[PDB]
């Protein structure tokens, strides 16, 4: 009955050295009810999904895009809001190597945690995104690592 659409970026960087490095994503904790997610939001009218994703990233974190990977991830949810209205919601995540350091607003954001996807799977509770994180880890493993 009510449809919502959101667009976000999974922000990653590689940390370490040519000898040892780890691919980590920027996990954000939202004071909005205390749960982990990635920078995401609605598209402003006329704005492409990718532009919306880059804009939200920037607004929430001050990071900049270095490059996007050729891949998106999608999750769908259904729930009820204030007026017991039925909301089918679809969220589209891009994946991007990112530069700069984080500048979060303490009002919106409770914590910022750089973890590998496996670190995140092992250590964090994030039902909104577990599937997304699982898929992303599978993707970067075949896309970026030997074979």
Do 38 and 128 touch, CB atoms closer than 8 A?
no
> CA 51, CA 122: separation in Å to the nearest integer?
31
For residue 32, what are the CA distances in angstroms to 14, 103, 106, 136? 29, 18, 12, 24
As for the chain, the residues directly before each break of C–N over 2.5 Å are none
3-state secondary structure of 96: strand
Helix H or strand E segment including 89 = strand 85-99
For 69, counting Cβ atoms within 10 Å of its Cβ (0-12 exposed, 13-18 middle, 19+ buried), the class is middle
Q: Give the experimental resolution in Å.
A: 2.6
- How many Cα atoms occupy the beta-carbon half-sphere of 76 within 13 Å? 2
CA 81 to chain centre: 23
Q: In whole angstroms, what is the distance from residue 23 CA to residue 145 CA?
A: 11
**What CA–CA distance (Å, rounded) separates 72 from 36?**
19
Say which experimental method was used. X-ray
**Token pair for 110:** 């409770």
Residue 69 phi, psi dihedral angles, 5° rounding: -80, 155
Class of domain 1-147: alpha beta
Taking Cα atoms as reference points, which of 139, 46, 132 lies closest to residue 90?
Answer: 132
């Amino acid at each position: 009955t009510k449809h919502e659409y959101s667009f976000g970026v999974i922000p990653i960087r590689f940390f370490g050295t040519p000898d040892r490095s780890t691919l980590k994503a920027c996990f954000i904790c939202h004071t909005d009810g205390k749960h982990w997610g990635f920078p995401k939001g609605h598209a402003e009218e006329k704005e492409g999904p990718q532009e919306a994703a880059e804009r939200e990233l920037v607004e929430e974190t001050g990071l900049g895009i270095v490059n996007f990977f050729p891949k998106i991830f999608v999750e769908n949810y259904s729930f009820n809001d204030k007026e017991e209205i039925f909301v089918r919601k679809e969220v589209t995540y891009f994946l991007a190597e990112v530069k700069g350091e984080v500048h979060a607003d303490p009002d919106e954001i409770c914590d910022v945690q750089w973890l590998s996807f496996q670190e995140g799977l092992r250590l964090l509770n994030f039902p909104e995104i577990r599937n997304i994180v699982t898929e992303a880890d599978k993707f970067v493993q075949s896309y970026l690592f030997a074979s």
